[PDB]
Symmetry: D2
Subunit: 329 residues, 4 copies
C-alpha cells in the first residue's frame, strides 16, 4: 500500500477534544456551521439531518474547503452515533418562520420534532451543552431542558444575542460608531415581546438617556423607539426580501459557541430559566444577561429595570408562559 | 441632536482603503461574501445584483452580523456607483450549470451579461483587480480581460484553485494527513478536461509516483485516478445532492482574495493567458500555477509536465479554444 | 538563472505599511503583536543601535513562514519608512524602577526633535501613534514638531490603563474583561482618573448598586483597583525590569482600529482644550473615535463633580510640566 | 457585597480543557507564550521558573493584556502544581549557547536541569505532550523521553521546524515567492550537522534539482549550499547582533503547538526516535518529517534521500548518538 510505503505508523489512536455537532442543515444550520468553521472553534464538526441527500451534499461542500480551514474532521449522518462525544450540540432543525409568521406559530410542530432529536443527542453526548436555535427559541430551550434531563446550566437558547447585535448595529449606524463601542441590551422573548433596556444604552459609559431623558418614549424627538421596532421587525423584513435569515444568526450562534468552547465567561442575553427574578415564580425561559462558559450558564446578571421596563419583561414572560405551560409533551 | 450631545465632531467626514465588491448575490456570491468578511480582508464590502429584494435582504442579513465582524461598512445597490473605489471586484453573477450540464454550456448567457457587468465595474474601480468566478471561468477570464482593457495580470480566474483543494482533501483522507501537508496540482480547465499533475504529487517532498510509478494510471492497484475523477465530478455530485455548490468555492475565492489583498505572492492554480507555454499559440486562458499578489498575477511557474500530462494540458487548451474562438463580443 | 528556468516574469509600493521607531522591549512587543494580528503588508523598524536593529529584523524575518506580512525591513535611515500609513514611536528613555514617567520628559522631547521631522519627511500623510513616555506630553510635542493636524497625532494614552482596570474588575467579578466596562481617563500615569460613574456590566451601573463606589466612603474600597492600575507599571518594572507585553497588545489594538477604519472608541491622548474650561493645549486621554484618519470625534463624557475635579487636576499636573519645556 | 448585588450565582469549577504550560520565562519561553496567546490555542496558560520576581512580573504583564486576548486564565508559580491538567508542556529552560559554542556543549548543564524539571512537569498532567525547545534539542528530547518514561509519540523536540522555516524564507527571498509556496526540508540535528534535502526542494511540485542537477553542490553556479550555511549560522548571527534569539523560535513552537492542540496532522520536521530508518540501529533522536496531532507524533514520513543525503543524515545521527553515549542518568 502506498500509504505504508510513505508513512510508518507509530500507534492506533483513540476521541475528539473540542467536537461540535449541528443538528439541521437548513439555512440557519449551515450558516452556524460555516461560521464555526471560520472561527476555528472545533477539532471535529458533525452534521445531522433526516434529509439524506441534502445532508451529504452540504457535508461534501464543507469538506472540499478543508485546505482553507483548521477543522480536520467534518462528518455527517442521519444516525446520531456520528455525534458522539460532542462538547456542544447546536439544534437548528424544525419548521422555520414563513413571511409574516410569528416564531410562536412554530411551537407544537417543533416540540414534536424535539421529541425525536433531544433523546438521540443525549444518548451519544450525555455531558454536552445544548444550544437551542430553532424557534420559538425560548420555549424550545425549556422543552430541550425537560426532555434532556440536563441541569439547566447545560441547556442554552441563542435567545436575544442576535436582537442585541441588531440593536447595536442600528445604534452604531445612527451615531457613526462601530457596534463594538455601542452598548445596549434587548431582553425577554426572542420575538415580538422583546424589551429594550433604555436605561443601560451607552457609548463609553455615557447613558444616552442621561442626555435625552425621553429616550425610547413617544416623546422622543428622534424616535429611538423605532430602533427597537426595527429590531423586532428585522427577521420579518429579511424573510420577505430573501426568504429566510441566515448570516446574522450564524454569527450570533458562533459567538455563543466561542464563549462556551473557550470558557470565556462573557455576558450574553440568552435563553435561561428566570424563576426567582422580577417576582417570576414559574419555569419561564427567556433572555437575561448570562455569564457563559465551559459549563454553560453559571451565573445571571441582575439588570436594574425601570418600572416600565420591568412591566414589559413580565409581559414577555406572561406571553411565553401561556404557551409553554400547556405544551403537549 | 442626541448624536451631537454625545459626540463632538472634530474632523469633516471618507474613502475606503481595502474595499471588496462581490457582483452576484446567489449562493456562490454570498459564500464568497461571508468567507471574505470572516477573514477580515476588507474595510468595506459592496454587493451588486439585479434582483433588488434578494440584494437588499442579503445586505441586511450581513449588516445585522456587524457586531461579530471587523468590516465597518456593508452596502449594496443595482447601481454600480456603490462599488466605487474597490481594490478587488469578484464576479460571480450569471447562469449556473444544472445537473447534466457542462459549465461550457453557460458561455453565451454569461458572455452576454459580462458585456454589461465588466464595463460598469471598471468605470468606478480603476485600481481594482478582477477576480472571475462565473463559469466557464477560464473563457470568462479571457472575456473579462478583452472587455475591461485591463492588463492580463489584473484579470484573474478562480480556475483550479478549488479543483486542487479538492484533490488535496481527497489525497489527505487517503493518507491520514492534513490537506496542508498533501501537495498536488490540478491544472487546465476548471471543468471536465482538468489535468492531475501526478508527477508533482508529494508529501514532505516525497513523490508518490516514485513510490508507485503506476500512480494515476488504470493499472494502479489503488486506483488513484478515481481521486481525479472525483475532483472532476465533485461539482456535479454536490449539485445532484444539495442543488448547487457554495461553501468550497466561497473558501477558494476567499483564499485568492487573501493573497491579493495581503500581497502574499503565494502560488495558486488560477486562470491566466498561457500563450507561449507548452507550444500554445492562441490567447487561451486556463489554470497554471501563478504567483498572486497586490498587482494580481505577476509571474507564472513553468511546471515540468510528463509527456502524457503535457498532452492532456494541450487537449484542455484545444477544448477551450474551440469555444473561445467562436465568441462574438 | 534557476529562478528564470522555474518562473516566467510578467511584471517588473506597499498599501498597508506600518513603521515602528524603537526596537526596545516596548517597540518589539508592538512589532510582534502587529505581525500576529495581520494588520500590515510591510513592517519597517527604525533605531540608532544598528546591530540590535538588524538582529531583531532578522529574528522576525525568520518567522515569515508563520506570518502573513510579506515584507519586514529595517534601517537607521528613515527612507526605509516611506509610504507608512501608521508610524508608531516607542523610542527614548524608558520608565525606571521607582520613578514617574514624567522623569523622562526632557530627554524624550530632545530625541523627538530628531525623530519626528525624519518621520514626517518620508510619510507626510501618516498617522503618528506616540507610545514613548510621558505619552500625553510627547503627543503634544509630536503634534507641534510635525505640523500635522491634530487628528493624525495620537497618544496610546490610557488604552492600557483601561485594559488593566477592566482585567482587575473582571477578576473581582468572575467575568471576562470584555464584559466589564469602565474607563480610566487623563494622564497615562499617577493622576489618571477612574470614571466610576460609567463602570458597568450588562449596562448595569456598579455605582447604582454602591453609590460610594471608588471613594474613601466605599465600604469595599474599590479605589484599591484604581491604585493597582496606577501602580501596575511600577510593580512590573520592579519584578521583570520593564513592561512590554500589555503595552504591545494595547498598541496593536489601536493600530487595528486605525488600519481597519473601525471607529471604535478608545481612551487615548488628544487635545482637550475647551473641555471643563481648560484653556491651554493640554493633551490627555478622553474617549475618542479612532479610524483611518486618526481621531475624528471625541465622546463628551459626563463626569461627576468628583471625577471632573480629578480630571482637571490631571490636566493641571501635565500642563505644569509641559509649560516649562522648550523646543 | 457588590458582586452579589450584581450577579446571582447558579452553579458551583471543571478542569481546563486546553491548558498549556511553558517552563522557563527567558526570551524563548516568553516568545512562545505571547505567540500561543495570540493564536488562541489555550484556555489556560501556566508559567514555571525558579526566578520568582521575573516569573511574577512576566505573568502580570501578560495578564494586563487579557482584554485583547481569548485566554481567560494566566497563572504562574515556582510550584509545579500550577501546571496541573496541561495538554501540552513546553520546556524552554536551560543554558543557552554563546558565540562560538556548540549547542552540544550545553548538554551536561541542561541534563542536570531536566533531571529536576521532567519528573515535576509530568507529575500533574496525565494527558500532556512534552515539547522540548531547550538545546541541544534532539539530545534533550531523548533525555526527556528517558526521564519521563513517556511513550515516544508524546515526547517531541522543536527540532528543525525552525531550520526548515528559515530555509524556506531564504528560498522565498531568492525566488520572489512567499515561503508558504517554497518547499524544502532541513533534517537531522538542529545544529551544525543538519541536512538540506535538495531532492525534495520544489515550487508547485517542480524539483529545483531537476532544473539544476548541480543544486546545493560546490559546482552550483548560484551557490545554493550557502542557503543551508545561512540556516546553520542563523542562530549565531542573530545572537551576535541582538544577544539572543526569540521571535522565530517562539513562532516555530506556536506552529507545533497549533498542530498538537488542534489535532491537525500536519507534517513537521521535529525531533523523534529514528531507530529502524536509514540503517540506524540505536535510539537516536533527530528531525524527520512527522505527522503531528492531539497524541503527539502518531506517524513518521519515510523520506526518500539520495545516497549523499542519506550519508549526511547518518553522519548527523552518528554525531548525536556519540553525545547520547555521554549521558549520565
Ligand atoms: Cl435530525 C431531525 C431533523 C428534523 C426532524 C427530525 C429529526 C430527528 N432527529 N432524530 N430523529 N429525528
Ligand atoms: Cl449585476 C448583474 C447581474 C446579473 C446580470 C447582469 C448584471 C448587470 N451588471 N451591469 N448591468 N447588468
Ligand atoms: Cl530612531 C532614534 C532612536 C532613539 C534616539 C534617536 C533616534 C533618531 N531618529 N532620528 N535621529 N535620531
Ligand atoms: Cl523550572 C526550572 C528552571 C530552570 C532550572 C531548574 C528548574 C527546576 N524545575 N524544578 N526544579 N528546578
Amino acid at each position: 500500500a502506498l500509504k505504508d510505503q510513505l508513512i510508518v505508523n507509530l500507534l492506533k489512536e483513540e476521541v475528539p477534544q473540542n467536537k461540535i455537532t449541528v443538528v439541521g442543515v437548513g439555512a440557519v444550520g449551515m450558516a452556524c456551521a460555516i461560521s464555526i468553521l471560520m472561527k476555528d472553534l472545533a477539532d471535529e464538526l458533525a452534521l445531522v439531518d433526516v434529509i439524506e441527500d441534502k445532508l451529504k451534499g452540504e457535508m461534501m461542500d464543507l469538506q472540499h474547503g478543508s485546505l482553507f480551514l483548521k477543522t480536520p474532521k467534518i462528518v455527517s449522518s442521519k444516525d446520531y452515533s456520528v455525534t458522539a462525544n460532542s462538547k456542544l450540540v447546536i439544534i437548528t432543525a424544525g419548521a422555520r418562520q414563513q413571511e409574516g409568521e410569528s416564531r410562536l406559530n412554530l411551537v407544537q410542530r417543533n416540540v414534536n420534532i424535539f421529541k425525536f432529536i433531544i433523546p438521540n443527542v443525549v444518548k451519544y453526548s450525555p455531558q454536552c451543552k445544548l444550544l437551542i436555535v430553532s424557534n420559538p427559541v425560548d420555549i424550545l430551550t425549556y422543552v430541550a431542558w425537560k426532555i434532556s434531563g440536563f441541569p439547566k446550566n447545560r441547556v442554552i437558547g441563542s435567545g436575544c444575542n442576535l436582537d442585541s447585535a441588531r440593536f447595536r448595529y442600528l445604534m452604531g449606524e445612527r451615531l457613526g460608531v462601530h457596534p463594538l463601542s455601542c452598548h445596549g441590551w434587548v431582553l425577554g422573548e426572542h420575538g415580538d415581546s422583546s424589551v429594550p433596556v433604555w436605561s443601560g444604552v451607552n457609548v463609553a459609559g455615557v447613558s444616552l438617556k442621561s442626555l435625552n431623558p425621553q429616550l425610547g418614549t413617544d416623546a422622543d424627538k428622534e424616535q429611538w423607539k423605532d430602533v427597537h421596532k426595527q429590531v423586532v421587525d428585522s427577521a420579518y423584513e429579511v424573510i420577505k426580501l430573501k426568504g429566510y435569515t441566515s448570516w446574522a444568526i450564524g454569527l450570533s450562534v458562533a459567538d455563543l459557541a466561542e464563549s462556551i468552547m473557550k470558557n470565556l465567561r462573557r455576558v450574553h442575553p440568552i435563553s435561561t430559566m428566570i424563576k426567582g427574578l422580577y417576582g417570576i415564580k414559574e419555569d419561564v425561559f427567556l433572555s437575561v444577561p448570562c455569564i457563559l462558559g465551559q459549563n454553560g450558564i453559571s451565573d445571571v446578571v441582575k439588570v436594574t429595570l425601570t418600572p416600565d421596563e420591568e412591566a414589559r419583561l413580565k409581559k414577555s414572560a406572561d406571553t411565553l408562559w401561556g404557551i409553554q405551560k400547556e405544551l403537549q409533551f
